[PDB]
Amino acid sequence: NAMAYSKIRQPKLSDVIEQQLEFLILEGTLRPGEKLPPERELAKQFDVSRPSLREAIQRLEAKGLLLRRQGGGTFVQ
Amino acid sequence: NAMAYSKIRQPKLSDVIEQQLEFLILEGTLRPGEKLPPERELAKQFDVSRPSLREAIQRLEAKGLLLRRQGGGTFVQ
C-alpha cells in the first residue's frame, strides 16, 4: 500500500570522527607518540560535539591506536 | 609546528535527506503526484529531526521536485 519510508542513513558522528582519526594515524599524519589536544580543544578544531569525540577516542583506545594516561593526555600508539 | 586538525567532514543532515528524497524521486520509487506524509510522520519514518527534513523539503521545492499546496500537503512533481 503506502510507501514505507526507510530510515535515512547518516553515519553516527562518533563513527565519522573515529574513521578520520584512524586514517590520520594509519597514514602517518599523526606520528607514534603524538599527543592529541585535550578534548575541548580537539573538538573545537574538529568542529564536533565533545561527547561524540569522546566516544570516538574510546573506540580508538579499544583498537590500540590511542592510549590515555591517567595522569593526563591521550597518545598515538 | 603543531598539527592543525581540520574540521571533520560530516555532510549536513538536511543535505543527506535532500539527496535521498531526490534519488527516490528520480529513480521513480516515488511517483509523480505522490503526496509525502506530513512533516511529523515523515521525520519519524526517516528518524531525523523535523527542522532538517523541513529544510530538505524546501530545497527540493526550489529544484521543482516537490510542490507544497497552501491548503496542505507536499507533492512529488
- Please tell me the distance in Å from B60's CA to the nearest CA on chain A: 16
- CB A54, CB A3: distance < 8 Å: no
- CB B45, CB B3: distance < 8 Å: no
Element (H, E) at A50: helix A50-63
- How big is the CA angle at A36 (ends A64 and A63), to the nearest 5 degrees? 15
- CB A60, CB A42: distance < 8 Å: no
Element (H, E) at A44: helix A39-46
Task: Inform me whether the C-beta atom of residue B1 falls under 8 Å from chain A C-beta atoms.
Answer: no
Kindly give, in sequence order, each residue whose CB lies less than 8 Å from that of residue B45, ignoring residues fewer than 6 positions away: A4, A5, A6, A7, B37
The resolution in angstroms reads 1.4
Q: Hey, are the CB atoms on A8 and B8 less than 8 Å from each other? A: no
d(CA B52, CA A26) in angstroms, rounded, equals: 34
Within 10 A of A5 (CB to CB), how many other CB atoms are there? 20
Best of A10, A19, A39 to disrupt the B interface by mutation (most B CBs within 10 Å)?
A: A10
Task: Inform me whether the C-beta atom of residue B10 falls under 8 Å from chain A C-beta atoms.
Answer: yes
Element (H, E) at A13: helix A13-27
The partner residues of A74 in beta bridges, in order of sequence, read A68
- CB B9, CB B50: distance < 8 Å: no
- Please tell me the distance in Å from A70's CA to the nearest CA on chain B: 23
Q: Chain B partners of A42 at a C-beta cutoff of 8 Å?
A: 5
Question: Which value, in Å, is the radius of gyration of the alpha carbons in chain B?
Answer: 15
Question: Residue A72 has what DSSP assignment?
Answer: S
Residue boundaries of the structural domains of chain B? 1-77
Cell of A37: 589536544
CB-nearest to B8 from A7, A10, A16 is A16
Rounded to 10 deg, the angle between the A39-46 and A50-63 helix axes is: 110
Provide the CATH topology of domain B1-77: Arc Repressor Mutant, subunit A (1.10.10)
Cell of B51: 527542522
